[PDB]
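Dear V.,

Thank you for sending over the compound details. I've combined the ligand you provided, adenosine-5'-diphosphate, with the protein sequence from our construct and run the structure prediction for the complex. I'm sharing the raw inputs here so there's no ambiguity about protonation or stereochemistry in the SMILES, which I know was a concern on your side last time.
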Amino acid sequence: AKILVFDEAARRALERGVNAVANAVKVTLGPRGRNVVLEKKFGSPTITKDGVTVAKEVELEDHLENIGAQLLKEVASKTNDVAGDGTTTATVLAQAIVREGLKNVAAGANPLALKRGIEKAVEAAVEKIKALAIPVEDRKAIEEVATISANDPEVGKLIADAMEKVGKEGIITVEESKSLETELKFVEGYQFDKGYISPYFVTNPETMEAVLEDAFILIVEKKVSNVRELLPILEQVAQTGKPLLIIAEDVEGEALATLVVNKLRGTLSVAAVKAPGFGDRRKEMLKDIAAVTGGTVISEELGFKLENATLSMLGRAERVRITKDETTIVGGKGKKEDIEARINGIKKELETTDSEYAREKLQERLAKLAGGVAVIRVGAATETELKEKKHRFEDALNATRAAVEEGIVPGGGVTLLRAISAVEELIKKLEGDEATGAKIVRRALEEPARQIAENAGYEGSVIVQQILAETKNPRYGFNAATGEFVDMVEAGIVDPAKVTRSALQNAASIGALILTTEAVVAEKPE
Amino acid sequence: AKILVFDEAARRALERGVNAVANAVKVTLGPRGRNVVLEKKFGSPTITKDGVTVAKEVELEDHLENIGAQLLKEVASKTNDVAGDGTTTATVLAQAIVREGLKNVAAGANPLALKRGIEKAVEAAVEKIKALAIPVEDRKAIEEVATISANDPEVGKLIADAMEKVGKEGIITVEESKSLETELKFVEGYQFDKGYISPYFVTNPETMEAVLEDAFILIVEKKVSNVRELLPILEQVAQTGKPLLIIAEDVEGEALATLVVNKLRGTLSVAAVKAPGFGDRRKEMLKDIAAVTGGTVISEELGFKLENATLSMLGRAERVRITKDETTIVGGKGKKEDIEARINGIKKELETTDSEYAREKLQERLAKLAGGVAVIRVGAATETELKEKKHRFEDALNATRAAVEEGIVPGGGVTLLRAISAVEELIKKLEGDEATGAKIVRRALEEPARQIAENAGYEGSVIVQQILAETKNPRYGFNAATGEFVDMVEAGIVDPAKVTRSALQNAASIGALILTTEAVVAEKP
Amino acid sequence: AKILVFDEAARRALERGVNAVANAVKVTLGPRGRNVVLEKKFGSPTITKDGVTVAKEVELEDHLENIGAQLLKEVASKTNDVAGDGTTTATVLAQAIVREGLKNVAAGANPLALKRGIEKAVEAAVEKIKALAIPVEDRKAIEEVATISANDPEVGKLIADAMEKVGKEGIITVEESKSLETELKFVEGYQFDKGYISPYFVTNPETMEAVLEDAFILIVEKKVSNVRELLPILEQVAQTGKPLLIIAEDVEGEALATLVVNKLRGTLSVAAVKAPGFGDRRKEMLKDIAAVTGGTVISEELGFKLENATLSMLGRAERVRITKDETTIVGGKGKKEDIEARINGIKKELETTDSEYAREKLQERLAKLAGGVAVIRVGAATETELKEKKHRFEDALNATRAAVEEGIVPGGGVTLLRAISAVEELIKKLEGDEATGAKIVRRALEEPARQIAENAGYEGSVIVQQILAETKNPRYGFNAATGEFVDMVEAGIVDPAKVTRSALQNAASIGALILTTEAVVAEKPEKKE
Ligand SMILES: Nc1ncnc2c1ncn2[C@@H]1O[C@H](COP(=O)(O)OP(=O)(O)O)[C@@H](O)[C@H]1O
Ligand SMILES: [Mg+2]
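Below is the predicted structure of the protein with adenosine-5'-diphosphate bound, written out as structure tokens.
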């Protein structure tokens, strides 16, 4: 029992959703976001100033409107997913683009033409972001960036060192130490891009992660779907009192169902994750895990049933962190020999490799194993003070890492504003509805800056003007925090150019999507 | 299926909740609070005059409005949590601040500016509370304070003595004696800031505590989540007929589930508490416990499984008291040797220590082990009369202890009133909406005093005036109890300056929060 | 049936209404202002840019909110009454004063004091307006005032042209032309809207006119129906060989039949035309006609018999045109002193006339007598366009009038911005809420300048700052039409000091009142929930 909806009817419904999210989220953008209250079904209410936190809690009653909300949240988040920030900024830009877009379409503008224009606009914008970016590759550079985003010259050093040694494609993590001091330690471990097969395996509802400490790592290679072939090992581990991380190529049917039940029951704290990589590439990576873990790849190939698996064929580590997009293994306890075994065998095969693509990938396995897993044990005094430093340091890390990828640009929306000039120049060479699109982007670009100042209790439009007024130094901007105009850079208010380029491109993507939408097939109230 | 709400729509909703609580609560403020009737689903109705009692029972049907009520209750209670009182007073102040705040915001005032001013106002107010605070450090001082908060000159003495000997950073506890007399004894024991992992471990529903007498103290270091590795020791202790206190770094899954079931079942009376401190700091404190208890830290480090734990590796004490925020061990039966062993090894490492922070903390461990554990065995006659004295004396203690940290000020709202002048001076240097905020706080400050007189059946505004009239002695105030103006201090109507400073700062926090609220995402019915 | 609303509840409601109207209006303010579309009961709608016109159409469903809407309308109209222009400006200033003020009331300020301060602040403001006023002294100065008020160069031109060739004491009229084009035309001699009492009088068959060259004017107050009384003069004239125009309350019966027959005969060339006005004014006008032609009025109440009339007491003119409904006496031979004394009798009488209607009647007389009557016939392709184009002319005139009266000041709200420094100085001498009151005006004074710039696509606050910034030459302002800061006066962006002063005084009058509200007694929403 579906329900069809076409043309403006549909686009307007989606927009409604888009606005629901965007309006709740943008009140937090900038140094002085406003408070958003979220109520928990059981616990008492919560108050935030974090866009992502609020975005997660936004779900609308109406199917069609919700579809828009979800659709926005998705594309918006895939910004934080590649730069660890700017998910809220992408939402704001998107709202604007959607609004003006639908307005002009309703006034007779051609959707496709608007799109062609919105795209050309963004290109020009991005190109300005680039030519405006400050590279961060020096030692001092990387440290300073992190030092700021963390607000701790020490953690800055650590983050810098951690990167210095593990490398760009290396592994770095922030762990909640128990000690009251923050230190940097280079343990053994691995990390691949796969996450919990079921959101029920989550340990912490807030962070949406599944944290396992001192657990076994059952490394399978088959599709574990039968309970009978799993109960044996599941039992041995049950009596161990320890948690279990399953890394099969997939866990479905009974298998996955059981794992989830006992997990939510308290019988056994587990978490299933799909095997890293694909094809030949995968078994090779499953071994990399067994090596650093001290377990063995239970492959049906070398003939071996699961039920006959010993509570010793499965390696283990000090801590395992599972995200919906990534699995991390800290404290690998495999034989330092097996590990160096892969590292070398990987280098040998690296000389025999000819395709640049294959090379880069062996490179990452090489950098994961070697260098290992730079860990930043975070010291606190309160469970509270910890969550704080934990978050702060973690972000500072993601920030800095992104910062290195695409340089940095002036923050506080200022970079997006400087992009306007580039869009203006484009418009002068454009005409028709296409030019209108370019104009739409140009208007959008003002929102972030404006919204920040606005949230801070200032006249958005006014500040945005005074900023665009200064043409001398493009780094000239408004620091909504102190309420003064300064050099955003020299004021330590910067953003990973990667984050900005993304938020924009993503927002513009959602916009183009909706303008090009001619129908939506939703589910009728079940 | 959520439900968004923005701008004034939201703020007004929250305010509705804020008022629901506040209006039910404030009718109890002061020496003559009015009666509030609360019905119990099963038992017959209840009547109170206690703000906190009433606040707990306030839950609204509307999600949005309730959100406000809960939000208030939280911030309001985190005053009683740091001073053991003034939760109701913080509520009243908050109601006022929220009202005037929203009013002026609706008239076009800038929220942030109002905040900036509400803040500056509080500062100046607090600063006056301080400069007006009565220090409690004398012998008579500390005794009198406690004597009052306990309503027992004897317990006052004991509390005074207990503090006199164990010291500021020392350990003091109130235990439910079996004797019909109240005494002070200086045993052996420990105490850390961690409570029952599950509210189901509670022994007394009223006091919300978990009291275990002559129990074993299974000191673990791993995350006990498996039943198999716990059943062995759980069984040995089960046949002992004695209770058990588990102090692992955490108890979850099956382990925590089983412990709770048998507890509520009657199979085994236990209670799980998380391990004190964090990190290296923690294992060091887990040993301090084993030392005073006569047990051993079951650490997987020194290689040792839990199932193989003997009913002798776990020390024991005469009584263990568990609160949702604190665990107390009275009657430590560890070898007097193992104890003095930590005391000295702690002093040696204390000379090698250089960071002032690390020092102060070894200081508390040092004061916990040494001085010991001043215990106040509480004598009663009824299980009822006991819970009462228990609570009363315990609060009196916490009150007095806090009273020593930050001095005392005139009660009956009078101190808050004296803060007005400070706010006035501030306003004269302020302008715009910022000045308005300051004015909001200034108006709020009158509520407590006013409300008290009101509840007592007098003209609030009138009394509040006659008080602000006298400029000579700031301790001049109205005693709603006798219906006469007197020296609040010399009249024994004082308040821990810490309590007051908190209630204000907290209320003003809720206020600023709501004014800065632009949206709320609630769950649909 | 009533509902009693107090405190903030009441003020907010009122404010909602105030803003409802004000925001519909402000959309028009300035050169880049746009139009509002007012639905009419039957025909096409009204498409204006005029404050009061829009304001008057606004009617809110909620009683309290509506009361607010009304109070604001009053500000609009009373300003239109006192100056005919600057209604939008007054609305904006009122809105501004109401919000900034209502805020302060919520903050605990005493409204009464706020009022006193507002009042004092306005006085100081007005005084500064006068202080910057420049007297209108030439064709340019006027072309400017008009071009602006109408927001059209062309309109400003014709108004200047006409105004010039009709003197500042003249009279200009706006009429509905028939072609697509607008035309400016002057009325030569004395003329009134009465035509030939009988089509037979016609002289030209191609123009349906009655042209009498060098003729005698017979001015009879009473009617005329009896042939007898006429014959004596008709013979005297007939023998003169000259044409004759007879002006009497009416010419009927055998008396008219005579003139016609003789006319058609060739006996005597004549034409009859009813008296100009009515009541005592056509009596006073006949005399006007008298003084202009030179003849004598056969005043039935001065003691004159038509039968005893003489060529000695007849009016004489160089020419006479009579259309189906209009009469024009060209080249009247009247005595100069008779005219002037006839004129200065109206002047030395206007200075005692109140009802603006009586001042308009006693003005078209003094206009005719000064042969100074211009008329702009506005053309357009559609009724809707025309009705607005027509209106713009009317506003431009009202402006011009006011400009001549109290002077001219720099436009674009610039002049009111300059009033700020005055209120500022005043504040330094004020205390308490009274000082707050003054501050309210201080802020309000920016609204006009802001909204103009705003509706043009600029930052209100920004522009107002740069203006208030350069304090060397008060004539410094922003040209919201070109987007450049300039000397407002030199740029030709000026406003009649009268409208400015009025707008503010009216805005401030209602505004302050509102701030003193503490209760409202309205109708309980009839059958609603
Ligand atoms: N080009 C211009 N630049 C700056 N101000 C202008 C310009 N044209 C008109 N104005 C100003 O706009 C104002 C009011 O315009 P208008 O829309 O006609 O409303 P109102 O009913 O108040 O007269 C005046 O102060 C006038 O001088
Ligand atoms: Mg006008």
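A first observation: Residues C 28-31, 33, 51, 85-89, 148, 411-413, 452, 479-481, 493, 495 surround adenosine-5'-diphosphate (ligand 1) (CB under 6 Å).

Warm regards,
I. M.
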